[PDB]
Structure formats: C-alpha cells, structure tokens
Amino acid sequence: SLLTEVETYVLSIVPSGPLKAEIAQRLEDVFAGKNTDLEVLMEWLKTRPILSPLTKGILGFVFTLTVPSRRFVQNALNDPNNMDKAVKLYSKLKSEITFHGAKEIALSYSAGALASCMGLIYNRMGAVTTEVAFGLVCATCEQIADSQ
C-alpha cells in the first residue's frame, strides 16, 4: 500500500502541464504490472521535452526498481561537498531494511545530498533493498518540492 506514497511524491516535482498527464498514466501502468520491456520507458523519458535532467533521473530511478529484470540518469544524479554527506548516509541505509525507517533518516539531510545519494545507489541496485530506495526517493522528492 506504500506504492501510492511514491506516486504522489513524484507527481510533485514534475512541472504542471500536458506532461504531468502523460507521466501519470505511464506510472499507473507499471504500478499495475503490465509493462516488462524496461528499455522502452527509459527511452521514452530521455526524449521527453519538458523534463528536467533531475526529473528524468528520479523517474528513471523509480521505473528501474519496479520492472522485473544508463548514463543519462547517472549524470543527472551525479556539486560541492554534498557528496560527502551522501557517502555516509549511503553506509547507513545499508543497515535499514524498511521504507519508513530510511525515509525518516533521509528527510533529515539536505536536498543536495539526497539527490546525489541516489546516484550512489544506482551503481549498485542490489546493495540496498527496494523499500529503502523508495524511502530515499520519497525523502528526496519532498525536500526539493518544499522550496516554495
């Protein structure tokens, strides 16, 4: 029942318009379990015109964690010392297993460290569990959508 907490949070950073409409459907399709060919929605993201590199990074991060079994996302997630806090946070998320446990800790750090922390996990999608990674996405999305 936590999959909806990722949905609404991701739909908070995407700029309003005819793009939040397209992304909305593509999300609630893989969140129902029909799409399998991972490298289709990946390409679909990369070519979309009103998406910031950061949004393409988070969306690409979420899609990968779903689908059963890229450089344009790594270069979006990863510029001063925010990497320094990310490395230590990354070493902590290994300890945590549940979604809410990591989200509680990740929400306590800067928005810069979180987005870069996601870059660390993308290199190893097996180092940490999925529930935690969602918690990182949820904490990341909220803090960057908390500026205004």
Author numbering: 2 to 70, 77 to 85, 89 to 158
Can you provide the manuscript's text about this entry?
As the most abundant viral protein encoded by the M gene segment, matrix protein 1 (M1) forms a shell underneath a host cell-derived lipid biolayer to connect the vRNPs with the viral envelope in mature virions. The full-length M1 protein includes 252 amino acids consisting of a highly organized N-terminal domain and a flexible but less ordered C-terminal domain that are linked by a protease-sensitive loop. So far, only the N-terminal domain of M1 has been structurally resolved at an atomic level, showing that at neutral pH the physiological monomers have a high tendency to oligomerize via a so-called ‘face-to-back’ arrangement, whereas at acidic pH the N-terminal domain exists as a dimeric structure in a so-called ‘face-to-face’ arrangement.
G88R but not G88E was originally acquired by the virus as a spontaneous compensatory mutation after NLS disruption. M(NLS-88R) M1, similar to wt-M1, is able to switch from a face-to-back monomer–monomer association at neutral pH to a face-to-face-oriented dimeric conformation at acidic pH. The residues Lys104 (part of the NLS motif), Arg134, Tyr100 and Asp94 on the ‘face’ of one molecule (Monomer A) interact with several complementary residues on the ‘back’ of a second molecule (Monomer B), including Glu29, Asp30, Lys21 and Ser17. The face-to-back monomeric arrangement of M1 occurring at neutral pH is likely necessary for the formation and maintenance of a confluent and strong matrix layer underneath the viral envelope, whereas the face-to-face dimeric arrangement at acidic pH may describe M1 that has dissociated from the extended matrix layer. We then determined M1–M1 interactions under different pH conditions by BLI. Regardless of pH conditions, M(NLS-88R) had M1–M1 interactions in a dose-dependent manner similar to wt-M1. Nevertheless, M(NLS-88R) M1 retains pH-dependent conformational transition like WSN. Compared with M(NLS-88E), that M(NLS-88R) has less difficulty to break the fulcrum likely translates into a smaller cooperative energy requirement of monomer-to-dimer conversion under subtle pH changes. This flexibility facilitates M(NLS-88R) M1 to dissociate from vRNP in the acidified endosome, thus prompting virus replication in vitro. Our results also indicate that the compensatory G88R mutation was not a random mutation but was chosen by the virus purposefully to retain pH-dependent conformational flexibility for efficient virus replication.
